[PDB]
Design a protein around this motif. Structure first.
Motif, short mmCIF file in Angstrom:
data_model
loop_
_atom_site.label_atom_id
_atom_site.label_comp_id
_atom_site.label_asym_id
_atom_site.label_seq_id
_atom_site.Cartn_x
_atom_site.Cartn_y
_atom_site.Cartn_z
N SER O 1 6.07 1.64 14.11
CA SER O 1 7.13 0.73 13.47
C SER O 1 7.74 1.37 12.42
O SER O 1 7.13 1.72 11.34
N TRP O 2 9.16 1.12 11.81
CA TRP O 2 9.84 1.57 10.78
C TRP O 2 11.13 0.87 10.30
O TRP O 2 11.49 0.35 11.25
N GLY O 3 11.37 0.74 9.14
CA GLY O 3 12.44 -0.06 8.52
C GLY O 3 12.87 0.80 7.37
O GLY O 3 11.93 1.39 6.61
N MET O 4 14.40 0.67 6.91
CA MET O 4 14.85 1.17 5.99
C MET O 4 16.02 0.22 5.24
O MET O 4 16.43 -0.92 6.04
N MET O 5 15.93 0.15 4.08
CA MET O 5 17.03 -0.75 3.36
C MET O 5 17.74 0.14 2.13
O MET O 5 17.14 0.93 1.73
N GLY O 6 19.13 -0.07 2.19
CA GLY O 6 19.92 0.95 1.45
C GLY O 6 21.00 0.20 0.68
O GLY O 6 21.50 -0.74 1.28
N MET O 7 21.17 0.19 -0.54
CA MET O 7 21.96 -0.48 -1.16
C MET O 7 22.85 0.10 -2.19
O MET O 7 22.10 1.10 -2.89
N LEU O 8 24.13 0.00 -2.35
CA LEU O 8 24.88 0.70 -3.38
C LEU O 8 25.97 -0.40 -3.96
O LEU O 8 26.67 -1.05 -3.23
N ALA O 9 26.13 -0.40 -5.44
CA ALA O 9 27.09 -1.28 -6.18
C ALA O 9 27.50 -0.46 -7.17
O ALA O 9 27.02 0.16 -8.12
#
Lengths: 11, 11, 11, 11, 11, 11, 11, 11, 11, 11, 11, 11, 11, 11, 11, 11, 11, 11, 11, 11
Positions: O1-9
């Motif tokens: 199982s795997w997860g990713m999170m990306g944020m740009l401001a």
């Protein structure tokens, strides 16, 4: 099972 | 101004 | 089973 | 001004 | 079984 | 001004 | 079984 | 101004 | 101004 | 089984 | 201004 | 099984 | 101004 | 201004 | 199982 | 199983 | 001004 | 100004 | 199992 | 199993 969420906001 | 969001779920 | 939701708003 | 939304569900 | 909903509004 | 909506259900 | 929905709006 | 919508269901 | 949306489901 | 959703909005 | 989104799910 | 999501926004 | 975020989960 | 995001999941 | 999170401001 | 995420933002 | 962060987890 | 990020996971 | 975290900030 | 993360930011 898998899920995705994407959000984009701009002024 | 602009804004869009999206979600996808699959079991 | 699967579901999707998409929203777009603009001024 | 503009706005549109959509939903799709499948079991 | 499956269902869909679509809405569009504009001024 | 304008607005339209639609729904579809299938079992 | 399958279903389709299409919407187009313009001012 | 213009607007058109369409739906098709087949079981 | 313009806007169009579409959905397709197939089981 | 498979589903698709596409949305396009412009001012 | 412009905006478009798309989703595809396949089981 | 597989899913995809794509979003593009511009002012 | 601009901002976008995204999440993906897969089990 | 511009912004685009994309996600792909495959099990 | 795997997860990713990306944020740009940005301002 | 594998997943990918890509984001691009610019002013 | 600018800022971006990212996280990835895989079990 | 510019910014882009990317993630790839493969089990 | 493995995880990664990356952060970038600038004024 | 393997994962990658890449980030690029510029003003």
């Amino acid at each position: 099972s898998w899920g995705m969420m994407g959000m984009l906001a701009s002024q």
